[PDB]
């Protein structure tokens, strides 16, 4: 009589790798590298803003595409390829740092800066910024000499941050197509804009000249920004070519920002995003997108690594 000890085996074994062998068969195994993508932005449980044609930096200056987002609030901010920060052509200086500040901001709450003016026009407008006809950035004012060619008075305007959070302050410098145009708008002579806080000082001289027409226009407005500390003051001194802020921005809280080309889906939950969707997974690794962001499995180069969940498979 006899008794034998044994272990199970299957005919359908699965190959894995060990320290000493490639492709040893085990009874069972499981994937460690995530390849399955959901082609949507799984936004359940999160206040989500889909910026559409509004570029993220445009929420601060307010071209017409951004009119609905001037004071937006969100946990999750989505930028889109069609998004433009601008109506009158130009760009933000140090733009990516500011995008990175705004992506995590929770959104922005705007506050009037209280500037008023005398001896000048305030109504500069352009057909590039269309609302009910020619208009401009909602949050800014294109300051002009009182009449064509007239002299633009030397001016100083100051704003203090009364709040307990740093204020985001933005202004513009207008680079006319020619010295002729710059004279028409602001009066002849050398133009200078200075901007100072207790921790920041910089000077700006417009530089007129021709550049390629963008939206039929060859001028440019470049935007500059700073963070103004609680209790600190910012002072602007200028005699023209200045695009003045009407309001400051305060950051609301916390958010995450992504860039994406797929639709939002408020019915699925997720925390790991890339431009093509959402990686929903508990696996420790992923091979979908090395730039994925949020709380993500780690990106690896290999498409598959099988972890044995059973013994060596030894069939007869």
């Amino acid at each position: 009589d006899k008794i034998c000890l044994g272990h199970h085996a299957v005919s359908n074994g699965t190959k894995v790798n060990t320290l000493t062998e490639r492709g040893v068969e085990v009874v069972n195994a499981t994937e460690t590298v995530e390849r399955t993508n959901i082609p949507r932005i799984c936004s359940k449980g999160k206040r989500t803003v889909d910026l559409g044609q509004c570029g993220l930096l445009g929420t601060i200056t307010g071209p017409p595409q951004c009119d609905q987002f001037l004071e937006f609030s969100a946990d999750l901010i989505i930028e889109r390829r069609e998004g433009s920060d601008v109506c009158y052509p130009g760009k933000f200086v140090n733009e990516e740092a500011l995008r990175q500040i705004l992506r995590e901001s929770g959104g922005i709450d705007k506050e009037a800066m209280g500037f008023t003016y005398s001896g000048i026009r305030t109504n500069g407008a352009t057909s590039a910024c269309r609302r009910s006809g020619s208009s401009f950035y909602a949050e800014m004012k294109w300051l002009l000499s009182n009449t064509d060619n007239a002299a633009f008075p030397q001016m100083t305007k100051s704003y203090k941050n009364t709040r307990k959070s740093p204020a985001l302050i933005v202004w513009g410098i207008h680079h006319s197509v020619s010295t002729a145009e710059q004279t028409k708008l602001y009066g002849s002579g050398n133009k200078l804009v200075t901007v100072g806080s207790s921790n920041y000082q910089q000077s700006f001289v417009p530089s007129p000249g021709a550049r390629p027409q963008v939206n039929g226009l060859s001028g440019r407005i470049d935007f500059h920004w700073l963070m103004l500390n609680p209790n600190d003051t910012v002072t602007f001194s200028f005699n023209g070519a200045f695009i003045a802020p009407d309001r400051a921005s305060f950051l609301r809280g916390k958010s995450m920002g992504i860039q994406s080309g797929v639709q939002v889906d408020a019915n699925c939950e997720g925390d790991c995003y890339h431009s093509g969707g959402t990686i929903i997974s508990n696996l420790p690794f992923q091979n979908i997108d090395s730039r994925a962001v949020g709380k993500c499995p780690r990106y690896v180069k290999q498409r598959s690594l099988l972890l044995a969940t059973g013994m060596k498979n030894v069939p007869e």
Partner: protein, 167 residues
């Protein structure tokens, strides 16, 4: 006709990982060992709990897919990202190769423990045949076989008969 783990595994053992297969006057039969089976599964579950983890660390974009960052900083970022990727790809390959080696050795070790336990229960009443079975030198009916499986076989009861049969 009947053989143990040294030759191969048993495709017919579907109730467990490890088991007993016997042959006596009442025929052949097979039963899973619940304890060794569970001990192996628990160690695999323990591995899975450790390896199926999520990082809690949040990362943000430092790059821009629509409007390319300045080339100097972009190249530093890409060099750093590719170096980090090399590290994680290496760690992942190693983790899995090292864990699969350990999983395989651990499963074999649970088989050896069961075998060694049964050897010690049987004392001088059986001999090893070299395939993972014991030739039992007394009549061992279905109750007796059950007593070996559930660890209540009393070698003293059969020793006289068995030792005589071994000569």
């Amino acid at each position: 006709a009947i053989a143990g783990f040294i030759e191969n595994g048993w495709e017919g053992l579907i109730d467990g990982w490890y088991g007993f297969r016997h042959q006596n006057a009442q025929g052949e039969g097979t039963a899973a060992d619940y304890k060794s089976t569970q001990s192996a599964i628990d160690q695999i579950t323990g591995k899975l709990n450790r390896l199926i983890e999520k990082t809690n660390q949040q990362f943000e974009l430092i790059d821009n897919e629509f409007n390319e960052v300045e080339k100097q900083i972009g190249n530093v970022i890409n060099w750093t990202r590719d170096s980090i990727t090399e590290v994680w790809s290496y760690n992942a390959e190693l983790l899995v190769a090292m864990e699969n080696q350990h999983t395989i050795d651990l499963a074999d070790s649970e088989m050896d423990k069961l075998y060694e336990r049964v050897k010690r229960q049987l004392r001088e009443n059986a001999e090893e045949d070299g395939t993972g079975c014991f030739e039992i030198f007394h009549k061992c009916d279905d109750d007796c076989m059950a007593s070996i499986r559930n660890n209540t076989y009393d070698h003293s009861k059969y020793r006289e008969e068995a030792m005589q049969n071994r000569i």
